Amino acid sequence: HHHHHENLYFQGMKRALEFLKECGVFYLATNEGDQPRVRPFGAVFEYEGKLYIVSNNTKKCFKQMIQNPKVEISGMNKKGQWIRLTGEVANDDRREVKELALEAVPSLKNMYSVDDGIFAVLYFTKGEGTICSFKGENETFSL
Amino acid sequence: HHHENLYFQGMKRALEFLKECGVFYLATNEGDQPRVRPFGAVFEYEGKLYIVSNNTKKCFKQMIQNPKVEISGMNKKGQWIRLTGEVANDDRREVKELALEAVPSLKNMYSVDDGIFAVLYFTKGEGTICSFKNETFSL
Ligand SMILES: Cc1cc2nc3c(=O)[nH]c(=O)nc-3n(C[C@H](O)[C@H](O)[C@H](O)COP(=O)(O)O)c2cc1C
Secondary structure, eight states, X not given: OOGGGHHHHHHHHHHHHHHHHHHOSEEEEEEETTEEEEEEEOOEEEETTEXXXXXXXXXXXXXXXXXXXXXXXXXXXXXXXXXXXXXXXXXXXXXXXXXXXXXXXXXXXGTOOTTSSOEEEEEEEEEEEEEEOSSSOOEEEEO | OHHHHHHHHHHHHHHHHHHHHSSEXXXXXXXXXXXXXXEOOOEEETTEEEEXXXXXXXXXXXXXXXXXXXEXXXXXXXXXXXXXXXXXXXXXXXXXXXXXXXXXGGGGTXXXXXXXXXXXXXXXXXXXXXXXXXXEEEO
């Protein structure tokens, strides 16, 4: 990842965001040492050209992402197209991002609030993805 | 024969649930890099839960290098599963034959003696089924 290619990465980020929105639910894979872990995730938003996911700083999945920032996401839309997005995540501790998350995905307010001490937002510092279709060439992108 | 059912009950519950899911997600490691992709089939053979792959795929190679995996997926009722375990390859023709009858879409690509088709079963595992509202079991 290079900051001066941010114009290119932005287009890949927007495609990933769009596609993950089409999927609705998607699956986030982490490691706990040599044990893979996977669970459904369902909230994504953009801020300052970055793709964010949300979690809770008390959860195993969060602790896993801190201990090993490498993750992979996969999901499928109603047409049977699917994504694989490989990358690294960083926790963003800025209060303003938490506020924005709750406005972008207001259903989050059912569980989280800005000053609850548990709400976490994390973004992809880098990543590479492929969107696969039954018919047609793979679409590849970077963020 | 509750005692005897125990060999089967966790596996049967996982099988039933993953069939309800249709598509589920299989996570492996490639060293320190987690990997996940959609899977679309499951079958049982003599009390064990099987999945399919082919021996040229990265996912298969990853499962041989590190047998630890986790599966997750959601059914049509707002429930989801987390199934953690270890997998083993099974080279037997008889199991591959049953696979092709249990999952007939495979016949489109695979045959028992094609040198590529692979089936793997859970040697052990632990599952949890959750709802927006937890059932746990062991394979
Ligand atoms: C549809 C759906 C969407 C979800 N979205 C998220 C989410 O975006 N972030 C999150 O932290 N948990 C989300 N969850 C909850 C996690 O799957 C759950 O907390 C899981 O247990 C966390 O992983 P862990 O047990 O390894 O810590 C979602 C669950 C469902 C079923």
